[PDB]
DNA sequence: GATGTGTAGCTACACATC
DNA sequence: GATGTGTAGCTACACATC
């Protein structure tokens, strides 16, 4: 027999059997070194390096997950390695093996690549694919390789990476990250810009992650896969440990874990719990003090959530945090905020042991409290110790305002402590918000919260004005007193009548804050002005006129917030405010509405006149059609689509509306037909125009349009089943509107996308009679009398036999 | 009160998690055997043919995307924000009665 | 476009071992 | 405690096929 031959069976016997299962690969592996090793002493080494290349192209063709192709491939990523371990551990101190073996595997590993890069750009997939597994498992163990190879592997990598199939470019980067320390921009360039979640992953995962790429990794916490946001914070921040506190900078730092512990899925949010509680706690040795100066407490606004999640996840330490008793003369914002999470922790899940010894009495908190209050406000790096008492200030007054008062002693002592601070001229609003809360838990009846604040008010009023004893207080004196209003009137929920001071209050400077020519002072005189409104009915009358000008004429930020009262004295009084002797007429206030929701220039503006409607609409105090319709309008419109806050209310508030009450979806039905003619003509007129900036795309093709108005409609979705909605035809009198308007529009393509979907519909045999009826009239009249296409026949001829076999079910008595 | 408004609350919020975004973002054996012996081995050139017509790349339209397919802002419009007045949060109005 | 089957990640709990 | 292993179930996203 020839001695090629030899080596030919050798090897395919044992290709044949490492096929079949992973049992033998350890033998196979020390095998083709020995058969290898007989080879290159009887002169045939390049016999050999020839026919491993030939099985080896066996296996490519099988597709990804062939069973067989794994063991082969882990069987020649094993050969390849098994030799280089042979040639790194003498390299670490026994040279210089006399056999070339170096220069064999340089040789043997050379020859290889080349072979299998003769398919890497092969049409088939299955070829592809297996090509670049092959490169991928034995990269790591190549060792030194030529130049010019070195190059050849970029150069079809850094085409690979674009290739069609998903699948090949996952491969391509695992090939590519072995050469990061160019590769690195592509695949920073990859984690950015391929559709398939799975490349961006691989491309993640296996980043360099040193100080310049990072912040594209953690870029993906919003990536739109789940599963892509869900392991940023498993893998990537549990393979940091603690090189985020140092390395990872605050701002981005704060807004990881926030995006985490409110995303709206439930997987992503137990993947950043968890972190934050098993991992980071562990990792800093239990200290929950340390751990919240991690997360910056002072500028953070979700340590709230950090916090429970926490609580939840150790339950066991929550009975071991001591606050030790008064020490309070070193109190961190940690420590003050841990007082404040841990004192509305055990009241809202009634941990009642804690709540008896491990907190300080009412009297003895009023010590620790004005304790702040002096060193911050009375008395002279000064302002970040201005800020940490205003803090801690704020945390101990957040918990005090639920402390358990059944203690006289305990209540005075404190009222005294706030009344003493809400008379500072210089308490920041912050704490100004919080001490009426409190002073507000501590009165026995409303007229006596009242009174104390009123008192306050005036106090601060009269101060100034016997001070210059041009009787008008000064201009920042009536920002105070006009804050320090409102959050006492968001409390007061009785008539005005009842409480003079209020009256007497608002006619002093309430209504000569409106008069004024200050922007803010103007806004808060119309938030105080409000206010009362939504407590006396006459005086949202007398003031309805008035704020509508306002929404007309004023600055952004006035026109914001004047609108937001007339939406809430609609809220609380309805249509009692307006269309009557005296009263403004209803067609006036919808012709601001229009304004500022048409308004392009002032988004926000657009939101909360968007918000606001639907909530009128929603409580039914609003029920005019052509205002609705242009309120649907504005959600699809090409002008809309760049406000993100405008789109998601209305995702959210369309749909409640149409699935609360029948009557809700009827109004759908009766205008939708109309609505989806004026936007077809806008995504045309859209379509054909050509100017500079067009994004045409920036629109919903009418397809989609159609499918949504037939889902809102849809007689299914409406969550309280009578048993006999199921009768209803709101979604056939829609159809039957459209197929009247269907002679309207122009275009074939159009014409067709609202055909192909109209077999999205709900018949039902229960269904009245003659509306099938009717609607079969108008669809045979559309098939029979017009010239269609192929695939809007088929679909349309389809709903026509929906009905035909539908009418014998119910012709039959 | 509340005992409908409760109701519906719970039903939107956990059923329309996945419609935020509200736009086009609305769902609603053989152990066959290789014989390596076989000299079948003029298929070698079929896996090494050039890719003629089959395009087997990418289209450069999709080879590059400015969203990033990032998650747009969340305003995390829930049923409680809609509820709470504008000006008076701790109030809120009856919709749904 | 619309499909059915696939598959990637988990998640969860019972454990058995160290 | 800490850890495996074992099965089972699940959801979004792939592919396959037509």
């Not at chain 1, 082969?72 to 050969?79: D, G």
């Not at chain 1, 009826?773 to 108008?778: A, F, I, P």
Request: proline share 3%; charged share 25%; aromatic share 8%.
């Amino acid at each position: 027999i020839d001695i090629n031959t030899k080596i030919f069976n050798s090897v395919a016997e044992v290709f044949q059997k490492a096929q079949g299962s992973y049992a033998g690969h350890r033998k196979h592996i020390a095998v083709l070194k020995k058969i290898q090793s007989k080879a290159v002493e009887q002169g045939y080494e390049d016999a050999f390096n020839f026919w491993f290349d030939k099985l080896v192209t066996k296996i490519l063709p099988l597709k990804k997950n062939e069973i067989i192709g794994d063991r082969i491939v882990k069987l020649v990523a094993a050969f390849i390695a098994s030799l280089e371990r042979e040639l790194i551990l003498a390299k670490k101190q026994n040279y210089k093996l006399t056999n070339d073996e170096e220069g064999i595997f340089s040789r043997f590993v050379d020859q290889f690549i080349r072979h299998v890069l003769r398919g890497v750009e092969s049409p088939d997939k299955n070829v592809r694919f297996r090509v670049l597994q092959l490169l991928a498992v034995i990269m790591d163990n190549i060792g030194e390789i030529d130049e010019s190879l070195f190059n050849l592997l970029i150069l079809s990598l850094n085409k690979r990476i674009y290739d069609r199939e998903p699948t090949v470019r996952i491969q391509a980067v695992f090939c590519l990250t072995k050469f990061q320390d160019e590769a690195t921009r592509t695949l920073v360039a990859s984690i950015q810009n391929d559709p398939s979640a799975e490349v961006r992953r691989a491309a993640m995962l296996n980043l360099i992650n040193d100080n310049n790429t990072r912040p594209y990794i953690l870029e993906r916490a919003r990536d739109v896969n789940i599963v892509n946001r869900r392991l940023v914070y498993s893998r990537i921040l549990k393979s940091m440990g603690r090189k985020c506190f140092d390395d990872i900078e605050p701002h981005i730092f704060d807004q990881l874990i926030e995006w985490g512990l409110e995303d709206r899925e439930l997987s992503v949010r137990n993947a950043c719990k968890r972190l934050i509680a098993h991992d980071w706690l562990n990792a800093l040795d239990g200290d929950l003090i340390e751990l919240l100066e991690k997360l910056d407490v002072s500028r953070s606004s979700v340590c709230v959530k950090a916090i429970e999640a926490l609580f939840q996840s150790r339950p066991d330490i929550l009975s071991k945090i001591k606050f030790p008793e008064s020490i309070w003369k070193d109190f961190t914002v940690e420590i003050a905020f841990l007082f404040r999470a841990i004192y509305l922790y055990c009241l809202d899940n009634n941990i009642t042991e804690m709540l008896e010894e491990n907190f300080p009495e009412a009297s003895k908190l009023s010590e620790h409290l004005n304790h702040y209050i002096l060193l911050r406000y009375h008395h002279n790096q000064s302002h970040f110790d201005y800020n940490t008492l205003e803090f801690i200030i704020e945390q101990l007054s957040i918990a005090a305002e639920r402390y358990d008062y059944s203690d006289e002693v305990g209540r005075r002592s404190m009222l005294t402590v706030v009344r003493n601070m809400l008379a500072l001229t210089t308490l920041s609003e912050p704490l100004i918000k919080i001490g009426i809360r409190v002073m507000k838990s501590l009165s026995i009846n409303e007229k006596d919260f009242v009174t104390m604040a009123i008192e306050i008010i005036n106090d601060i009023r009269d101060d100034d004005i016997e001070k210059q004893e041009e009787k008008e207080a000064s201009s920042a004196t009536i920002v105070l007193c006009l804050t320090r209003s409102s959050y006492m009137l968001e409390l007061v929920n009785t008539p005005l009548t009842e409480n003079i001071l209020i009256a007497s209050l608002m006619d002093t400077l309430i209504t000569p804050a409106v008069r004024n020519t200050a922007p803010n002072i103007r806004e808060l005189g119309v938030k105080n002005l409000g206010l009362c409104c939504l407590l006396d009915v006459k005086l949202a009358i007398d003031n309805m006129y008035i704020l509508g000008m306002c929404v007309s004429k004023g600055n952004a930020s006035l026109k914001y917030i004047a609108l937001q009262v007339i939406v809430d004295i609609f809220s609380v009084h309805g249509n009692t405010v307006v269309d009557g002797e005296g009263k403004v007429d209803s067609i006036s206030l919808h012709k601001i509405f229009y304004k500022v929701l048409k308004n392009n220039g002032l988004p926000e503006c657009q939101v909360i006149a968007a918000e606001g409607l639907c909530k009128l609409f929603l409580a039914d105090v609003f029920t005019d059609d052509d205002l609705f319709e242009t309120l649907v309008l504005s959600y699809f419109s090409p002008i809309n689509s760049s406000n993100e806050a405008l789109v998601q209310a209305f995702a959210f508030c369309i749909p409640v509306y149409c699935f609360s009450h029948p009557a809700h979806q009827q109004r759908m039905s009766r205008t939708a037909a109309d609505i989806l003619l004026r936007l077809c003509v806008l995504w045309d007129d859209l379509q054909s125009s050509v100017i500079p900036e067009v994004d045409r795309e920036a629109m919903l093709k009418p397809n989609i349009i159609f499918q949504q108005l037939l889902f809102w409609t849809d007689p299914r979705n409406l969550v309280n089943q009578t048993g006999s909605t199921k009768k209803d035809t709101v979604q056939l009198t829609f159809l039957i509107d459209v197929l009247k308007i269907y002679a309207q529009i122009e275009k074939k393509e159009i014409k067709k996308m609202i055909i192909t979907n109209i077999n999205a519909i709900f018949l039902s045999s229960e269904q009245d009679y003659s509306t099938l009826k009717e609607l079969l009239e108008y669809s045979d009249d559309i098939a029979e009398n017009d010239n269609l296409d192929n695939v809007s026949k088929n679909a349309l001829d389809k709903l026509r036999n929906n009905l035909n076999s539908l009418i014998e079910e119910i012709n039959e008595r | 009160m509340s005992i409908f408004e409760k109701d519906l609350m719970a039903y939107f919020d956990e059923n329309l998690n996945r419609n935020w975004r509200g736009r086009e973002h609305w769902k609603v054996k053989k152990v066959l055997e290789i014989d390596f012996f076989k000299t079948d081995d003029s298929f070698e050139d079929k896996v090494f043919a050039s890719k003629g017509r089959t395009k087997i790349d990418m289209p450069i339209k999709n080879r590059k995307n400015d969203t990033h397919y990032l998650l747009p802002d969340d305003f995390h419009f829930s049923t409680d924000r809609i509820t709470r007045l504008f000006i008076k949060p701790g109030q809120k109005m009856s919709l749904f009665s």
